[PDB]
Amino acid sequence: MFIQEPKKLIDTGEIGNASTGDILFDGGNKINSDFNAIYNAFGDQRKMAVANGTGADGQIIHATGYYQKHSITEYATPVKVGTRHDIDTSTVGVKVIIERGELGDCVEFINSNGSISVTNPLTIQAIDSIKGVSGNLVVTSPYSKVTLRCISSDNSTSVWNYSIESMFGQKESPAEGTWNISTSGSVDIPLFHRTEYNMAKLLVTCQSVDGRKIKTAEINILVDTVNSEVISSEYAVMRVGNETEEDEIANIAFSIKENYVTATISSSTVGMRAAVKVIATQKIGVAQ
Amino acid sequence: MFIQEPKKLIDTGEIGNASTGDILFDGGNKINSDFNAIYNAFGDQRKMAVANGTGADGQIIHATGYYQKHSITEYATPVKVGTRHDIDTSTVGVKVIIERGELGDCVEFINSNGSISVTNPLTIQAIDSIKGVSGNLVVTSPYSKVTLRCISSDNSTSVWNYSIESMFGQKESPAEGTWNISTSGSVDIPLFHRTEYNMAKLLVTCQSVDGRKIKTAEINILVDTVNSEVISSEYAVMRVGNETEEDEIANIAFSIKENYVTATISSSTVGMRAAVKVIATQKIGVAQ
Amino acid sequence: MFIQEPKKLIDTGEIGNASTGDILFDGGNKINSDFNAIYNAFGDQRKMAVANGTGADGQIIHATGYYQKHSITEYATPVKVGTRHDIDTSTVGVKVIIERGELGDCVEFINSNGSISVTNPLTIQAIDSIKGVSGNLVVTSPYSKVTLRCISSDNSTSVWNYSIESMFGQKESPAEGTWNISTSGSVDIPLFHRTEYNMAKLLVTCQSVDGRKIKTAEINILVDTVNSEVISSEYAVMRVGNETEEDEIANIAFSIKENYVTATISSSTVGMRAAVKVIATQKIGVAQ
């Protein structure tokens, strides 16, 4: 691997005190050290073995950043903080050890070839320990994104915590916010175009300006594109200021309006607010 | 657009072999090429048209990175790997083509002005193909964040996969971990301050040290701030080592303790563990 | 704090017109300015107080980027766009003000020591305003990740929107895609290895090639590792082209096959498609 050297700056404090040759040589080397540091942090390090990362196929600065591909033997020694790794466990699980860190230090892993599995896992040992983990962190989720951050260092205590996420998938939410129920006692909230999702899950919480009346409900909806309708299933309903055990406080209905799956929320109570959030969706794609 | 040139390094191998003029000119140009490469990867490229990105309003290095605003005509030719784009489909949908990639290569898109929609979409063609997609990837989610990564190259096979997420929203989880049920047979787990959310959804899974007894349940809770209480709706309950079809294995209750919405988990069985995770929340904000 | 100066480039347009001393001094200073800009955007700025960030413990380029630790007095003045902050509200809540932005400008916050709470919050004022927020954005979620992006500038209107996420947690999805139901009328979809999760939540949507028949359902499953079985709870079922109010359109079953929790989907209708997505999971870890 390439272990950069800290930042070097040109000592302009000299020059009319050390002739050219000496200054240009010392300067250039410092400049090269710095650029190699930067380029290797945002570019493929495997290219250093060729013209020191120069040439027509030399290193480039990736705006998206870069995750290094290192070999098993290279992971025999602790990885530096701030580094990024694209793990390959295709032929065998790999273990990575992270040097002791300091508050905020971070190391991120990616799994572009999806080799991570239970038999060929990504084992991570963060010098000292990982919170909520006994010993090493064993990652078995293919095509995953693992982020480790140091949440406590001071002195003799270097503790890290982590996050694990899928590199891919449709995670977007088509709608999230709060809307007022107009004096007319009803409000339409466009969720998404009829063609974007087949199914969606939302949470709806309606509360009066004084918080005396409030209702919350979870709703799964199915988009029936052929009949231009939307089927819904509301459950886990909870209310507080309901005058009667029959009084809804707020009713939620669905339909397609202007080609947009739409939530229509109405209520008797005046000055009712309604928070609407889509927390999941499903779109039938193409098999395989 | 600005298409950087690979990394260039100063040939200190010369100097006391090529006079100053030649070395300073060749050096400076290389230095400028490199810095332009870096600055354009982390800064606004539209500024290059002014003093080559210099001046009081010249380019700067964004620690957060930067997403370039390019024109339609500029997207007529394949985009390089490692680039970032802030898409604008306000007047018309835009198509972007990504050059053939290699394992790990990445390209990320953002939609700051929220112009993406079904009529003015973001169409992406990743040289060769995108997994789970027939032809081009058509993005219609406004204010979205799209990430494309190459998951297979080798030779004649350049396949990419993608992720789509919302740029905005409250996605945080107020609590996730595992707690022991003390010998007293009960444990309180603070979830969040009474004022942070009106509604929350959690998953609870309790298992004995030997895995003979286990229960899982999903729970939606409503924070009644006025009466300082928390209403709950537990469902999808599943158990395995239940001695009786009336034996709960573990009971979950909610209330406000010390002003924190709190989960109280108790069980007869000794040595019971309980995993608690909040997978969704809803907070009534301000309309509009 | 360190407020970088815009990009500076070496004026090769001179040299055989201004002797060495003048060019090397002016050049070096520009080079240093640029590198300080880069290093301070991707490295610890607190090190500038020592040898200007040089030395054996000097600044380094973090591939993961870096989030600066600034003091209360330093936040008395507006923060520049593109900066990253690791907030510390351990002794008192801190307020940060963001200078007016332009479309796409971004500022990101992290909370490595988890000091953020309701009593010691992170208050953010984005010059002009934040959408869906009345006044300042008040963050009370510990160990959070806050991202602010400018979604509208033009002229007199500088509006921002934000996202809040947990820095840590297991958020990965073990499976998401679409599968064809073979002519045999049944398909097995491996979800994850039996040891990865104790509980999972999935959404399943099956639709015929012509969209006349379709069913959607939400399912929570519990992995019974001791008996090598999987218990399930299917609900919120919705159908459209059901010939009978008893006709399922598609049946979903679960079990462990080859040691992988597996979904088995079967249907009478020919040419049925099935979208399967795991939107939540729970793994019993170690208490504390």
Side-chain angles (χ1 to χ4, degrees):
Chain A
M1 308 175 279
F2 168 75
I3 297 174
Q4 68 185 297
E5 290 201 296
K7 181 187 62 176
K8 302 182 189 306
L9 292 177
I10 296 179
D11 182 0
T12 62
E14 283 185 352
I15 300 176
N17 54 174
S19 267
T20 313
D22 294 307
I23 276 55
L24 298 191
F25 181 81
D26 292 357
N29 280 59
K30 289 184 172 184
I31 289 179
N32 292 177
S33 184
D34 291 355
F35 283 133
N36 277 172
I38 298 172
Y39 273 77
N40 284 105
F42 303 124
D44 194 340
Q45 290 175 16
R46 295 169 301 179
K47 290 173 177 179
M48 283 299 285
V50 174
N52 296 306
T54 55
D57 192 41
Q59 290 175 157
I60 65 174
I61 297 297
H62 293 62
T64 59
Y66 201 84
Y67 292 74
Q68 309 302 321
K69 287 80 156 185
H70 299 301
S71 67
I72 291 70
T73 52
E74 299 186 293
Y75 282 125
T77 35
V79 164
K80 280 286 185 299
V81 296
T83 63
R84 272 179 171 180
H85 313 266
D86 194 327
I87 300 300
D88 170 13
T89 66
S90 54
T91 57
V92 59
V94 303
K95 174 173 182 184
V96 182
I97 314 174
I98 301 172
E99 75 179 336
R100 176 183 288 261
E102 299 185 67
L103 186 58
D105 281 336
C106 174
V107 172
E108 305 169 311
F109 306 75
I110 264 305
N111 185 38
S112 302
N113 68 19
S115 49
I116 295 182
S117 63
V118 296
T119 69
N120 305 200
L122 199 203
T123 304
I124 301 169
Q125 181 175 190
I127 286 311
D128 271 24
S129 60
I130 302 170
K131 177 178 179 177
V133 176
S134 293
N136 302 326
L137 170 60
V138 187
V139 189
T140 63
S141 181
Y143 294 116
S144 51
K145 162 72 174 306
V146 183
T147 303
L148 270 103
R149 173 94 52 187
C150 183
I151 63 176
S152 177
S153 59
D154 296 3
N155 187 65
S156 298
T157 103
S158 182
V159 182
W160 303 69
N161 203 334
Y162 69 105
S163 68
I164 167 60
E165 327 164 65
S166 297
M167 291 170 73
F168 317 115
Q170 281 186 274
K171 314 157 181 178
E172 80 286 359
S173 167
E176 186 187 322
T178 305
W179 291 262
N180 279 141
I181 290 187
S182 63
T183 50
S184 61
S186 184
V187 66
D188 282 343
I189 306 171
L191 302 180
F192 50 83
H193 187 275
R194 68 151 78 216
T195 66
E196 304 188 74
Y197 309 106
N198 304 80
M199 175 280 175
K201 163 88 92 355
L202 30 164
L203 293 175
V204 178
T205 298
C206 303
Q207 171 163 286
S208 58
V209 291
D210 69 301
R212 67 187 185 74
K213 275 176 168 290
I214 175 167
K215 167 194 171 171
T216 316
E218 175 158 20
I219 310 93
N220 283 7
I221 59 184
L222 169 59
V223 180
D224 179 342
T225 196
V226 175
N227 297 174
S228 290
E229 302 191 307
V230 53
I231 301 170
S232 57
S233 182
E234 184 178 312
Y235 57 96
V237 173
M238 288 174 285
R239 300 167 292 170
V240 158
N242 42 133
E243 286 160 44
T244 299
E245 285 50 57
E246 302 168 62
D247 164 24
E248 307 94 288
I249 294 180
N251 287 292
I252 309 84
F254 296 85
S255 75
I256 298 194
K257 302 186 178 194
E258 315 191 72
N259 289 307
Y260 272 78
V261 179
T262 301
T264 294
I265 298 162
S266 55
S267 174
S268 304
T269 302
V270 183
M272 280 295 290
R273 268 186 178 183
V276 182
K277 176 194 274 195
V278 174
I279 62 180
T281 67
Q282 184 156 58
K283 186 180 188 178
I284 292 174
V286 172
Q288 300 179 291
Chain B
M1 308 175 279
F2 168 75
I3 297 173
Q4 68 185 297
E5 290 201 296
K7 181 187 62 176
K8 302 182 189 306
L9 292 177
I10 296 179
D11 182 0
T12 62
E14 283 185 352
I15 300 176
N17 54 174
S19 267
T20 313
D22 294 307
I23 276 55
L24 298 191
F25 181 81
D26 292 357
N29 280 59
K30 289 184 172 184
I31 289 179
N32 292 177
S33 184
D34 291 355
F35 283 133
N36 277 172
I38 298 172
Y39 273 77
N40 284 105
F42 303 124
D44 194 340
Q45 290 175 16
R46 295 169 301 179
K47 290 173 177 179
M48 283 299 285
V50 174
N52 296 306
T54 55
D57 192 41
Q59 290 175 157
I60 65 174
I61 297 297
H62 293 62
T64 59
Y66 201 84
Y67 292 74
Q68 309 302 321
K69 287 80 156 185
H70 299 301
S71 67
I72 291 70
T73 52
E74 299 186 293
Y75 282 125
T77 35
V79 164
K80 280 286 185 299
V81 296
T83 63
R84 272 179 171 180
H85 313 266
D86 194 327
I87 300 300
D88 170 13
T89 66
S90 54
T91 57
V92 59
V94 303
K95 174 173 182 184
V96 182
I97 314 175
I98 301 172
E99 75 179 336
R100 176 183 288 261
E102 299 185 67
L103 186 58
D105 281 336
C106 174
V107 172
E108 305 169 311
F109 306 75
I110 264 305
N111 185 39
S112 302
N113 68 19
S115 49
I116 295 182
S117 63
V118 296
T119 69
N120 305 200
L122 199 203
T123 304
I124 301 169
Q125 181 175 190
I127 286 311
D128 271 24
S129 60
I130 301 170
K131 177 178 179 177
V133 176
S134 293
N136 302 326
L137 170 60
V138 187
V139 189
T140 63
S141 181
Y143 294 116
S144 51
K145 162 72 174 306
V146 183
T147 303
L148 270 103
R149 174 94 52 187
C150 183
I151 63 176
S152 177
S153 59
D154 296 3
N155 187 65
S156 298
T157 103
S158 182
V159 182
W160 303 69
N161 203 334
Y162 69 105
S163 68
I164 167 60
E165 327 164 65
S166 297
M167 291 170 73
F168 317 115
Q170 281 187 274
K171 314 157 181 178
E172 80 286 359
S173 167
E176 186 187 321
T178 305
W179 291 262
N180 279 141
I181 290 187
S182 64
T183 50
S184 61
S186 184
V187 66
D188 282 343
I189 306 171
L191 302 180
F192 50 83
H193 187 275
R194 68 151 78 216
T195 66
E196 304 188 74
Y197 309 106
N198 304 80
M199 175 280 175
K201 163 88 92 355
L202 30 164
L203 293 175
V204 178
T205 298
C206 303
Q207 171 163 286
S208 58
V209 291
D210 69 301
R212 67 187 185 74
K213 275 176 168 290
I214 175 167
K215 167 194 171 171
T216 317
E218 175 158 20
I219 310 93
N220 283 7
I221 59 184
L222 169 60
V223 180
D224 179 342
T225 196
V226 175
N227 297 174
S228 290
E229 302 192 307
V230 53
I231 301 170
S232 57
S233 182
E234 184 178 312
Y235 57 96
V237 173
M238 288 174 285
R239 300 167 292 170
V240 158
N242 42 133
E243 286 160 44
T244 299
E245 285 50 57
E246 301 168 62
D247 164 24
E248 307 94 288
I249 294 180
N251 287 292
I252 309 84
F254 296 85
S255 75
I256 298 194
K257 302 186 178 194
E258 315 191 72
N259 289 307
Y260 272 78
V261 179
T262 301
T264 294
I265 298 162
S266 55
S267 174
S268 304
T269 302
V270 183
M272 280 295 290
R273 268 186 178 183
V276 182
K277 176 194 274 195
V278 174
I279 62 180
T281 67
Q282 184 157 58
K283 186 180 188 178
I284 292 174
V286 172
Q288 300 179 291
Chain C
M1 308 175 279
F2 168 75
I3 297 173
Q4 68 185 297
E5 290 201 296
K7 181 187 62 176
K8 302 182 189 306
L9 292 177
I10 296 179
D11 182 0
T12 62
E14 283 185 352
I15 300 176
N17 54 174
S19 267
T20 313
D22 294 307
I23 276 55
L24 298 191
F25 181 81
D26 292 357
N29 280 59
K30 289 184 172 184
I31 289 179
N32 292 177
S33 184
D34 291 355
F35 283 133
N36 277 172
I38 298 172
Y39 273 77
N40 284 105
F42 303 124
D44 194 340
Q45 290 175 16
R46 295 169 301 179
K47 290 173 177 179
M48 283 299 285
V50 174
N52 296 306
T54 55
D57 192 41
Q59 290 175 157
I60 65 174
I61 297 297
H62 293 62
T64 59
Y66 201 84
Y67 292 74
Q68 309 302 321
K69 287 80 156 185
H70 299 301
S71 67
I72 291 70
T73 52
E74 299 186 293
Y75 282 125
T77 35
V79 164
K80 280 286 185 299
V81 296
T83 63
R84 272 179 171 180
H85 313 266
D86 194 327
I87 300 300
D88 170 13
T89 66
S90 54
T91 57
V92 59
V94 303
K95 174 173 182 184
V96 182
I97 314 175
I98 301 172
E99 75 179 336
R100 176 183 288 261
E102 299 185 67
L103 186 58
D105 281 336
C106 174
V107 172
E108 305 169 311
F109 306 75
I110 264 305
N111 185 39
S112 302
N113 68 19
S115 49
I116 295 182
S117 63
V118 296
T119 69
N120 305 200
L122 199 203
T123 304
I124 301 169
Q125 181 175 191
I127 286 311
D128 271 24
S129 60
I130 302 170
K131 177 178 179 177
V133 176
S134 293
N136 302 326
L137 170 60
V138 187
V139 189
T140 63
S141 181
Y143 294 116
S144 51
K145 162 72 174 306
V146 183
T147 303
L148 270 103
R149 174 94 52 187
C150 183
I151 63 176
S152 177
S153 59
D154 296 3
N155 187 65
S156 298
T157 103
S158 182
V159 182
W160 303 69
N161 203 334
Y162 69 105
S163 68
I164 167 60
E165 327 164 65
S166 297
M167 291 170 73
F168 317 115
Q170 281 186 274
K171 314 157 181 178
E172 80 286 359
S173 167
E176 186 187 321
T178 305
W179 291 262
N180 279 141
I181 290 187
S182 63
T183 50
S184 61
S186 184
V187 66
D188 282 343
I189 306 171
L191 302 180
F192 50 83
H193 187 275
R194 68 151 78 216
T195 66
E196 305 188 74
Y197 309 106
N198 304 80
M199 175 280 175
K201 163 88 92 355
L202 30 164
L203 293 175
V204 178
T205 298
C206 303
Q207 171 163 286
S208 58
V209 291
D210 69 301
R212 67 187 185 74
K213 275 176 168 290
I214 175 167
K215 167 194 171 171
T216 317
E218 175 158 20
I219 310 93
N220 283 7
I221 60 184
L222 169 59
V223 180
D224 179 342
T225 196
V226 175
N227 297 174
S228 290
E229 302 191 307
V230 53
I231 301 170
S232 57
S233 182
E234 184 178 312
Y235 57 96
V237 173
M238 288 174 285
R239 300 167 292 170
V240 158
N242 42 133
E243 286 160 44
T244 299
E245 285 50 57
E246 301 168 62
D247 164 24
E248 307 94 288
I249 294 180
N251 287 292
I252 309 84
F254 296 85
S255 75
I256 298 194
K257 302 186 178 194
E258 315 191 72
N259 289 307
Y260 272 78
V261 179
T262 301
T264 294
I265 298 162
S266 55
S267 174
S268 304
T269 302
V270 183
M272 280 295 290
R273 268 186 178 183
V276 182
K277 176 194 274 195
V278 174
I279 62 180
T281 67
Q282 184 156 58
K283 186 180 188 178
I284 292 174
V286 172
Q288 300 180 291

